[PDB]
Amino acid sequence: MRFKDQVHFIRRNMKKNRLRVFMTILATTMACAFLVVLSSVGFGIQKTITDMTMSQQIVTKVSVMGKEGDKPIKKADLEKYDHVRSVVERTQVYEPNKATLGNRTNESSNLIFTNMNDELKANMELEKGRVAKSENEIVVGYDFAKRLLTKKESEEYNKKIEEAKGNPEDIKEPKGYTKDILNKTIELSVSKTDSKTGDVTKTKTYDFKIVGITKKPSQDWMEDSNIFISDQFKKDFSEFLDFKGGNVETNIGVFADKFENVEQLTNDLTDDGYYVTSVTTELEGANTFFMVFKIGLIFVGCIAVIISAIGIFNTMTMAVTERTQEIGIMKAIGASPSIIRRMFLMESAYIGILGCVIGIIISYGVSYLVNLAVPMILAATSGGDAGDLNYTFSYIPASLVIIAVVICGGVAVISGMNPARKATKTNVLTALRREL
Amino acid sequence: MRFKDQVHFIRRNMKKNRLRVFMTILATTMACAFLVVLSSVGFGIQKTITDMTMSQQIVTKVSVMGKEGDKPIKKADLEKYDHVRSVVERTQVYEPNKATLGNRTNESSNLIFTNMNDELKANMELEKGRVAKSENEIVVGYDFAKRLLTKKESEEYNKKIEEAKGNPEDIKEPKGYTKDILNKTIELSVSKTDSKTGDVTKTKTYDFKIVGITKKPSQDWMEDSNIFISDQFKKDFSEFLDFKGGNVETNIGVFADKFENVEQLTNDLTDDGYYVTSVTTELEGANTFFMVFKIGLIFVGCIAVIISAIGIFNTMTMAVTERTQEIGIMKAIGASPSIIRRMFLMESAYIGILGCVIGIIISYGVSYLVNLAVPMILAATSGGDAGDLNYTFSYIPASLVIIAVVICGGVAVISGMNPARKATKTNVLTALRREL
Amino acid sequence: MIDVQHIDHSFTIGKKGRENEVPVLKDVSLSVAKGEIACIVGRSGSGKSTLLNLISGYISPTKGRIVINGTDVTGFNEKEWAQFRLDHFGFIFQSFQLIPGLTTYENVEMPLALKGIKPSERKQKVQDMLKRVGLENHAAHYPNELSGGQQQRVSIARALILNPSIILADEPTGSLDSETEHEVLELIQQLNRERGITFVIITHDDEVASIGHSKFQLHDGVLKGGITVEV
Amino acid sequence: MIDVQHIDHSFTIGKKGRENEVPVLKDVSLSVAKGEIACIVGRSGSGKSTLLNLISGYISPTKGRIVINGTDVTGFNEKEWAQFRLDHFGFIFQSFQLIPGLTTYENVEMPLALKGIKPSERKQKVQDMLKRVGLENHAAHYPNELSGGQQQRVSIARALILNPSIILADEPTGSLDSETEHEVLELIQQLNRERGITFVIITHDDEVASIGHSKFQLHDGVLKGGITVEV
Numbered sequence A, B: 001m002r003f004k005d006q007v008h009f010i011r012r013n014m015k016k017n018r019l020r021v022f023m024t025i026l027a028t029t030m031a032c033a034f035l036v037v038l039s040s041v042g043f044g045i046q047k048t049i050t051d052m053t054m055s056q057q058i059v060t061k062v063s064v065m066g067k068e069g070d071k072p073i074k075k076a077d078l079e080k081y082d083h084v085r086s087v088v089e090r091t092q093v094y095e096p097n098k099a100t101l102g103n104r105t106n107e108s109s110n111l112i113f114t115n116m117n118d119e120l121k122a123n124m125e126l127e128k129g130r131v132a133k134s135e136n137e138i139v140v141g142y143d144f145a146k147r148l149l150t151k152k153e154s155e156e157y158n159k160k161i162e163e164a165k166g167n168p169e170d171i172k173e174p175k176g177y178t179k180d181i182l183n184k185t186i187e188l189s190v191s192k193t194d195s196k197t198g199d200v201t202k203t204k205t206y207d208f209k210i211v212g213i214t215k216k217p218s219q220d221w222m223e224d225s226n227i228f229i230s231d232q233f234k235k236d237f238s239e240f241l242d243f244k245g246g247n248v249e250t251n252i253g254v255f256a257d258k259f260e261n262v263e264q265l266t267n268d269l270t271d272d273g274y275y276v277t278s279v280t281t282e283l284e285g286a287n288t289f290f291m292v293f294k295i296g297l298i299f300v301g302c303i304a305v306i307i308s309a310i311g312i313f314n315t316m317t318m319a320v321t322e323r324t325q326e327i328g329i330m331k332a333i334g335a336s337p338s339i340i341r342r343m344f345l346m347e348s349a350y351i352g353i354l355g356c357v358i359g360i361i362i363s364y365g366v367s368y369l370v371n372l373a374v375p376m377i378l379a380a381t382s383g384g385d386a387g388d389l390n391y392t393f394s395y396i397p398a399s400l401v402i403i404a405v406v407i408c409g410g411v412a413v414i415s416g417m418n419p420a421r422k423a424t425k426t427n428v429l430t431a432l433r434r435e436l
Numbered sequence C, D: 001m002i003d004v005q006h007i008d009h010s011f012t013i014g015k016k017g018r019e020n021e022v023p024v025l026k027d028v029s030l031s032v033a034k035g036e037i038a039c040i041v042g043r044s045g046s047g048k049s050t051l052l053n054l055i056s057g058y059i060s061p062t063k064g065r066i067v068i069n070g071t072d073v074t075g076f077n078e079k080e081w082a083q084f085r086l087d088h089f090g091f092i093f094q095s096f097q098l099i100p101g102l103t104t105y106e107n108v109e110m111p112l113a114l115k116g117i118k119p120s121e122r123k124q125k126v127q128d129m130l131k132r133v134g135l136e137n138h139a140a141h142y143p144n145e146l147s148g149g150q151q152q153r154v155s156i157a158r159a160l161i162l163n164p165s166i167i168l169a170d171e172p173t174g175s176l177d178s179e180t181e182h183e184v185l186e187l188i189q190q191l192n193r194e195r196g197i198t199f200v201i202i203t204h205d206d207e208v209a210s211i212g213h214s215k216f217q218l219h220d221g222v223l224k225g226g227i228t229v230e231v
């Protein structure tokens, strides 16, 4: 009757039925732990995919390399399409330049005029530093410092490349500017030449502060000596020189907010006559593979919820149907059916909460253990360190814990309350006899 | 006790305990069905990835664009690397040609000299037909037939192109040879030209039987008019307009068996000085992501086996521990503990086999239903574009059914035999009292 | 006061389809006055336990009317019947119907908890009741750590602990020796005299049936009885 | 022949650590001749069921020696004890220990299946046994669907179905009226006379104790009966 009496008698029956109580707590615990651990692998996969989308530009890139009915491509209209995270137009100019840090000068750098806000929005891949925000701030490639050579090392390089020749397999490249090129100022000098004058005419230098270093190229054989100037200096460089054809290679890239929007974006630009290559054009069926993978994740989560709920339901139905005779005795003594149902609701809620708590603790422990072990397995099976990926194997959000606890505890409560309800509904002698 | 008597009494007790027997059968059935359905989603993902690898060929391509210490790259030494399913060297020649099917001629087709066996081993992407196997047979591109044009529409095309005057948007390309270009024969005429004579010198034609059509490039705009001739037909087009390197472009692609070996292959070529790209350098950590996904699949399968085994264990332990008093009565009457254990082994094996059979039937039904439904979900969510992957959402191998049945039935047998053994080992009064 | 009026009860057994009928009670009429011990004697399987289960509402009669303390209890649902049993009824079960997970003490104190009897007073009540049935030393025992007669006396103590207006005793001395049975009979007679508790005692013992103010014979589902012994 | 020799038995109960002993039997010696009905009487809770459970090997004595038919049965494992019980023992249980999932027929028939007699030759045996205990019409009933005395007679019939050399009856008439109990006593005496079955009958009834050739009193855990007189 009194709540304290109900707790007392539930506790005493629990103490004398340790195997049954352990079976039910184990069912709820294993259901909760399995749900959280499985969905945490799913959440870690989703987090890894999202992190790859942030890091690698190629995932969400839709390169625009022309248009049907040849007309100039306007960057402004490319952002009109939906799910366009950024549009990066790079005006790659191969004209000579004289970026100098003082005693050491650079010649092989390639100018790239790009909107820095677009590069920041497109998640420009940088090894160190951040994308330029102001106008004079610039980003340079991974090999820009390596190309900074004084006259002495330049002469050594010329001698080593022209006297030796033969097989250039092993030529000692100068270390260049081994120091921190980041947060330093260079002097960019551009010459006009032209056949009309036939020599170096008026020349002007710009004071550019390196703030970012682009990502190291995929393989060592790729040289990234690019230097990125904001498009606000495009007007100045047009007033200075005419970069029209010959040594200009525009690279337009339309970025998607998510990979799942890449296929739709590519189709949108294709049916507007843009010559676009994306991940979904290079890999046929990439979007539908991602879609069937997400459908599989959802279906796996659903059948996992089903197996967890079925396990809890089986164990709790068995356990409470083993108490039918006790419910009959209590009803015979004078316990109201509502009191008996409240006691069994308290018992099933306690079993569910204890099992959910233990399962959540086990889930966090297993998540910690697998997030430690997966790097170990990867190192064991790398065979050469493999590639460099920032992955989450198992990731437990708080929402996942909430949903798993709600599902498993609710199933425990309902499955412990159904047999109790039907035992309180029947006549006493039916329960005293354990049904027919 | 005769076997027939044991079966009879097991059946009678099963008939009077329908809820308990149903709970155990449901536990075994849901365990088996969950194991098979989940692992079938995993097997279907593996099958989809294998089919993508077998068809796309961009997945396993490691294209070699050069070598450090410039030396002529040899295909024979490239196959010496491990896990190389093929090495396709394509000698793309842009020299003039006169591929003619009769009244219609072709000029824009680009000759490609490649080892036909290598193309077959590399899974050459064909829309229709098969890769050339003989010296005479050739494979042509998707747009080769559409480029077969007679002068009648050639004049219209020329005037339409010239009359656009900066607006080639509305240009009606002739439909060309809309008939079945497959299994036909063309006349490939190659001229000598050269500046020493300044005109058309001796000319020779060849009868080439088209057997294959290369895959239609996605996104349109890509006029694949290539024609592929075997490398055993070499120098027969080189004696006319020898390959000075001005137009001849070589495309070497080292293919791997399975994507798992693409990263190892790319690293292998890279440490040997080759300038390779492949997928694992375009996408950083791609092999790592695939390995983490495989580890996740294994871990998910393991925890699924654990949850299914735990559910069977819970239900069967509960059910047989509810039989402890009956086992005590059996032992008291004179039933040998071995006879009681054999009866409970028969009951557990029957429950496990029935549950495994029902779960396998449910697994095949669910697999059929989800393989029907996933195309429907794909049509609903992304509209109608799911005709470019050829995925298998759920795939049940026979080995999976065998393993799941063995696991679930064995867990049923051991979980129903452990409490029975405990009850038979104790003294009779302990079981008659349902422990102390 | 128990007023069983023209009570017919049957049971249905067998698999679905071919179902048999077990006519147990036919036109059974039993009137027990307030503060009277009615003893129901009959052969094994005559329906005496069925009659007590009908009186206590453990089963509903196939037809007939049961009126207890003036209130028609046929047609009570489980909630109404449970409240009525807590208020008026103590039941001594033939199989003693003890809760396996509770000790002797907790079994006897369960109805006191159900009635809200303030555990401090419950301690003394259960101690005195256990001493009255000779179970003072077995309070910590579980039912499976008791003799059959000790479990019987736990059932007796659980039924008598609330001092109900009606005690339905189903063979309450069948597992007891003569001395323990005499002690239980003396306790029953003391409760009948002092608290005025109405007893309906099924018994196979002539000594137990002799303590009743009335005797009722169950034979082939017919309660002949009709005799009020002058004690 | 039962030879219980200086049998001490105690029970251990309580939470782990705070375990207390329950001395039940002290130096109990019981000799039952072959073909003799020994009746063990005693107050409820004196250890009579404990004594029968020791004789049948349901529990092992704390100390002492049980010798049945000349073979030392203390030290038997579960397999040895089960074979010995099937060969020599029938047990009538105080709580009747019927299998809930079997009918009356299947319950009585189970010992014959365990002895593997014949399913066809089992029909006549179980039918005759059920008729001898007045349960011909209840063969299809489950123990759920039986009276306490009918379940008692199912236990009696299951114990007597194999005609064992020893029947350990734990209060085999406590749930029976005088007529049914007299029929059961007559059946017991017929089996003792004809098959020479040794009976050890715990009873609280004077008539049942009177049918015995031996009487043993259990008081304070001591079997001070030592009664063996001619008939």
Ligand SMILES: Nc1ncnc2c1ncn2[C@@H]1O[C@H](COP(=O)(O)OP(=O)(O)O)[C@@H](O)[C@H]1O
Residues within 6 Å of the ligand: C011, C012, C013, C022, C024, C042, C043, C044, C045, C046, C047, C048, C049, C050, C051, D138, D141, D144, D145, D146, D147, D148, D149, D150
């Ligand atoms: N649940 C049931 N189903 C079918 N028959 C039953 C059930 N319970 C009792 N019976 C039958 O009803 C008759 C009277 O039962 P009961 O009142 O328990 O006997 P008693 O008079 O010995 O107490 C018995 O023959 C018994 O077989």
Ligand SMILES: Nc1ncnc2c1ncn2[C@@H]1O[C@H](COP(=O)(O)OP(=O)(O)O)[C@@H](O)[C@H]1O
Residues within 6 Å of the ligand: C138, C141, C144, C145, C146, C147, C148, C149, C150, D011, D012, D013, D022, D024, D042, D043, D044, D045, D046, D047, D048, D049, D050, D051
């Ligand atoms: N499993 C057990 N644990 C502890 N004590 C027990 C157990 N079984 C019986 N007893 C105690 O042993 C004493 C004798 O028991 P028992 O032989 O069953 O009684 P009876 O002589 O009435 O048949 C009783 O007082 C009882 O409380």
Ligand code: VO4
Residues within 6 Å of the ligand: C147, C148, C149, C150, C175, C176, C177, D042, D043, D044, D045, D046, D048, D049, D094, D171
């Ligand atoms: O088992 V006893 O208390 O009936 O003698």
Ligand code: VO4
Residues within 6 Å of the ligand: C042, C043, C044, C045, C046, C048, C049, C094, C171, D147, D148, D149, D150, D175, D176, D177
């Ligand atoms: O068969 V009955 O319940 O009178 O003992």
Ligand SMILES: [Mg+2]
Residues within 6 Å of the ligand: C048, C049, C050, C094, C170, D147, D148, D149
């Ligand atoms: Mg009865």
Ligand SMILES: [Mg+2]
Residues within 6 Å of the ligand: C147, C148, C149, D048, D049, D050, D094, D170
């Ligand atoms: Mg006893």
